[PDB]
Structures are given as C-alpha cells and as structure tokens.
Chains A and B, each alone.
With several copies, the nearest count.
Chain A
Amino acid sequence: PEWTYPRLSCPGSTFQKALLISPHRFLIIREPFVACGPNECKHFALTHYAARNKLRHLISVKLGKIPTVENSIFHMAAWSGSACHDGKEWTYIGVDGPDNNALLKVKYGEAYTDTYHSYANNILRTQESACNCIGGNCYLMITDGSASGVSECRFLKIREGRIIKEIFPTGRVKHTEECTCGFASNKTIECACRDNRYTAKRPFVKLNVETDTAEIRLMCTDTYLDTPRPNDGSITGPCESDGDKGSGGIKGGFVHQRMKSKIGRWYSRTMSKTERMGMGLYVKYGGDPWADSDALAFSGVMVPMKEPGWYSFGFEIKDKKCDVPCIGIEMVHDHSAATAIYCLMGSGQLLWDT
C-alpha cells in the first residue's frame, strides 16, 4: 500500500536474546538472514543440502517457524542471495550459474524480472544479508572477483524488480564482499563488509541514497571485526593501513540505532581471533567509523566460546511506529545452521548468551 522508509529506532540501550530457531534438535541450510516487511518477518536461507551447486536454493519461512521442507518456500535457484520488502511487495535476489559466468536474478512478488551479469568473470556474489529499500528504491550490494585477490563491489538500485542504476563506489575498493547494510539516516546506507584477503578491518561503505554515490574506507577502530584477527589495536599506520591475518574472513552483524540526535552502531564479532567460535556484541555511538580509532564498547556475549559463531547479520523489525534493530547469528552444527536472534530491547546489560 505505501513505500517503506527507515524510521527512528525503538528506545533501548541493550540487546537481549530474543529467539532461537534450531531445527536439528527435534532441511540443511546455510547463511540465514532475516528480512522484515511492515507486518511480517521472514527467515531466509540458502539450502546447503537436502533434508555453490546446481541445487542450492533461496528459501524462506515465517520467522518463528522451524525451516522444514513442508514449511519452506523455494523462491529461486541460488547459491548466493538476499531479500527485502519495499513496503508493497517482496523482492528476492539470487545468484546462480557457473563460477566464472554467474548471473544475478531478481524476483518481485511472484515474477522473475531483471538479471545482472558477472563483470569480473569470477564468482558473482551478493550480500548474504537483507537488502535496503527506501521509497521503493532497494539497494543491493553485489561483488565480483577473486576469493583471494581483487574483488571490487558495486551497488544496484532496484525498483519494482528492475535494475535501474549501477552505483560504482570509490575509495578503497580492492576487496569488498558480504556487506551487512542498513540505514544510518534517510540519506545514507552504511555497510560493514568482509575483506577476505587483505585485512582484518572491515571495509565500511557509505552510500548516499539521494545522490546514488558511494565511498569505501576501512573502519579505523582498534577492535578488529573480521574472524582471523590481529590482537586488537595491533595494526600500525593510518586508518587505511592493511594489517596481518587478512586471509579469510566472515560476514558480521551490523545494525543502526537511529535516535533523533544520534546514530548508534552495533557490531558483532567472534570470540576467537582465529576460529569461528562464540559471538559478542560491540557498540559505538556517534563518531565516524572511517576515522575514529576508538575501540568499540563491549556490550556482551551473545554466543559463548564453546558454541559456533559463524555468520551474523543485521535486520530490523517494524514495530508499528518505530524500528527494532536486531542481530542474528548463524550457528553451524555438524553443516546445517540454527539461527539465534538478539534484539535491542530494554536497558541494562546483555544478560545471557545462546
């Protein structure tokens, strides 16, 4: 009925465990994410196996449902993908095809609409997190390049299933992928990205949605957010300096808390500096991620060191009048995954883990 715009966030100062979806304790999926419309949240995932291949699909269930075969809806063939709601209808994004000649497909509602072709003739990938719609214009991060080497990203502006504009970010673009994006304000989409080869510092994208321009710089903060990591504050040189332990990586969580006079930036990180174990929640209020070296504050442990952390993502729940920022965690077990959701709610400290 109406287009969605980002709204100010619901009051609160901390996160608490909200919900755990753990289908194996009673369909094998990976890289889950959550996307929400005005009155509906969906839990999306890619199938990994049956209850990069020709059989992987983008599937979903209502958030709160266990993602069984009977409950799941198969939206499209996809070894990589994302989804979002523009206030009127669901947009589903997926990538399929050959590693060196992959293609993006866009589905709107029930129909297939536009496609996008690989540009670096390497595995085309999308953000594996939900896409961001403002006024009907959905901004999707895509990337195409080497797993190890250069992989420049670009953004697609998608309107009613069609790709209307290609946005080519400037700045430090040598390797950007698996971006967790959200609105900082009505004018800006910010993303905390993976760098799978050069550094443990996440590229931080600032996309201007009034001008359709973007610039990427590494986060300057001493607390490094990727999985392989130097031991906090150990990377020397200016903010843009690449550090050690840059080979490999993980998609992290990232949400914004939009307050009338402030932007809170909530980030997630693993507990281990080398292995994908545990998850913690970190926060910084205000500042500029591209210049501010200040360590992120530690809010608390979301997943203990003894449990798998793996991928995380940001999403927001539409609470009638305000938005609720949430960070989800993909707990991979043996390789299906459980999804743990932590949401901003109330005040005080994060009190318990998953």
Chain B
Amino acid sequence: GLQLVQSGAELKKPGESLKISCQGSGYTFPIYWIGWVRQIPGKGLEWMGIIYPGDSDTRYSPSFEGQVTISADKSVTTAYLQWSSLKASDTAMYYCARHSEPWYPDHRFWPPYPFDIWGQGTMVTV
C-alpha cells in the first residue's frame, strides 16, 4: 500500500491563485524527497523542484524559481505546489514523485535519486 495520491483537476482564471496537493502513504514521509514534475500534454516532463518534508528544505529548477512555491506539511503527510499569480501556460499535468531512497540532513549531499513512485497527476487548466 505505497502511494502518492493527488487531487483530481482544477480550472482557473488568469491571476486566480492556486494550490494543489499530494498525499503520501505507505512510507516514512519526513525522510524522502518529493518532487514536482510538469507536463504540458504535447511536451515531455519538466522537473520543477523537490522538497524534503521533515525540515521543508527545497530546491527549484532555475526556470521555476520564483514562479512556483513548493511546500509540505508532514503533519498530514502531504506535499503542495502553489501559485500566487496563476497565469495561463500553467495548462499542464502536474505530478508528484518520490525519490527511491531516504535522505537525512547529515548526508550533506543533493539526493542523486530517480523518482520511484509517482502520483496519478493533477490536471490544471490555465
């Protein structure tokens, strides 16, 4: 029973704020990094960033730095992707994915890990 469960879909207006989420189950959530991956339906996958619930340590792809916010709350075993100014162009499928191995702060390295489990994806229009 190992899974990432995402919200279904959203449709927004340009400028309308947006928050979507992933809930983890079946694993020790606070020690694995969860990443967000964007996919415009006719395009390939685009790594947007990762978060380490547990101390909410984040890393963003330079192209998404300042465009989106990645946050998490270990209290309810969830990860979030937020927009403040949802523009258009955010008409993409957004996926969470969890790294194959755990990481602890004292490892002192950037997790060189693949994404082992993926959520089903949240479709966001606009």
List residues of chain A with CB under 8 Å of any chain B CB: 123, 146-148, 196-197, 228, 245, 247-249, 274-276, 334
Once the chains bind, are A148 and B109 in contact (CB under 8 Å)? yes
Name the contact of B30 in the complex, choosing from A196, A197, A247, A334 (C-beta under 8 A): A334
Report how far A147 CA is from B103 CA in the complex, Å. Answer: 13
Once the chains bind, are B109 and A274 in contact (CB under 8 Å)? no
Name the contact of A196 in the complex, choosing from B28, B107, B110, B113 (C-beta under 8 A): B107
A sample of 8 more A-B contacts (CB under 8 A), given A248-B101, A249-B107, is A148-B108, A196-B107, A197-B109, A248-B103, A248-B109, A274-B102, A275-B31, A276-B104
Question: Does B112 count as interface, using CB distance less than 8 angstroms?
Answer: yes
Which 10 A-B residue pairings sit nearest by Cβ, starting from the closest? Answer: A147-B108, A148-B109, A147-B109, A248-B107, A275-B102, A274-B102, A275-B28, A247-B112, A275-B31, A196-B107
Report how far A249 CA is from B103 CA in the complex, Å. Answer: 9
Name the contact of B107 in the complex, choosing from A123, A147, A275, A334 (C-beta under 8 A): A147
Once the chains bind, are B109 and A247 in contact (CB under 8 Å)? yes
Report how far A228 CA is from B113 CA in the complex, Å. Answer: 13
- 13 A-B residue pairs with Cβ-Cβ distance under 8 Å, sorted by A, are A146-B109, A147-B109, A148-B108, A148-B112, A196-B108, A197-B109, A228-B101, A228-B102, A247-B113, A248-B101, A248-B102, A248-B103, A275-B28
Please give, as numbers and ranges, the residues of chain A lying within 8 Å of B31 by CB-CB distance: 275-276
List residues of chain B with CB under 8 Å of any chain A CB: 28, 30-31, 101-104, 107-110, 112-113
| Nearest A-chain residue to B108, judged by Cβ | A147
Report how far A147 CA is from B106 CA in the complex, Å. Answer: 9
Report how far A247 CA is from B31 CA in the complex, Å. Answer: 15
A interface: dominant SS = loop
Report how far A197 CA is from B104 CA in the complex, Å. Answer: 14
| Nearest A-chain residue to B28, judged by Cβ | A275
Report how far A196 CA is from B111 CA in the complex, Å. Answer: 12
| Nearest B-chain residue to A178, judged by Cβ | B106
CB of A218, distance to nearest CB on chain B (Å): 20
Please give, as numbers and ranges, the residues of chain A lying within 8 Å of B112 by CB-CB distance: 148, 247
Report how far A284 CA is from B85 CA in the complex, Å. Answer: 58
Please give, as numbers and ranges, the residues of chain B lying within 8 Å of A247 by CB-CB distance: 101, 107, 109, 112-113
Please give, as numbers and ranges, the residues of chain A lying within 8 Å of B113 by CB-CB distance: 247
Please give, as numbers and ranges, the residues of chain A lying within 8 Å of B107 by CB-CB distance: 147, 196, 247-249
CB of B75, distance to nearest CB on chain A (Å): 11
Report how far A146 CA is from B28 CA in the complex, Å. Answer: 27
Report how far A166 CA is from B82 CA in the complex, Å. Answer: 53
Please give, as numbers and ranges, the residues of chain B lying within 8 Å of A276 by CB-CB distance: 31, 104
Please give, as numbers and ranges, the residues of chain B lying within 8 Å of A228 by CB-CB distance: 101-102
CB of B33, distance to nearest CB on chain A (Å): 12
| Nearest B-chain residue to A52, judged by Cβ | B108
Once the chains bind, are A248 and B30 in contact (CB under 8 Å)? no
CB of A265, distance to nearest CB on chain B (Å): 25
Given contacts A275-B31, A334-B30, contact A123 B102 (CB under 8 A): no
Report how far A245 CA is from B113 CA in the complex, Å. Answer: 11
Report how far A271 CA is from B10 CA in the complex, Å. Answer: 43
Please give, as numbers and ranges, the residues of chain A lying within 8 Å of B110 by CB-CB distance: 148
Report how far A275 CA is from B27 CA in the complex, Å. Answer: 10
Please give, as numbers and ranges, the residues of chain B lying within 8 Å of A196 by CB-CB distance: 107-109
CB of B26, distance to nearest CB on chain A (Å): 13
| Nearest B-chain residue to A128, judged by Cβ | B106
Query: Residue among B30, B109, B112 with the most chain A CB within 10 A?
Result: B109
CB of B24, distance to nearest CB on chain A (Å): 14
Report how far A219 CA is from B104 CA in the complex, Å. Answer: 24
CB of B112, distance to nearest CB on chain A (Å): 6
| Nearest B-chain residue to A245, judged by Cβ | B101
Please give, as numbers and ranges, the residues of chain A lying within 8 Å of B104 by CB-CB distance: 248, 276
Report how far A27 CA is from B31 CA in the complex, Å. Answer: 23
Report how far A49 CA is from B62 CA in the complex, Å. Answer: 31
Please give, as numbers and ranges, the residues of chain A lying within 8 Å of B30 by CB-CB distance: 334
CB of A125, distance to nearest CB on chain B (Å): 9
| Nearest A-chain residue to B103, judged by Cβ | A248
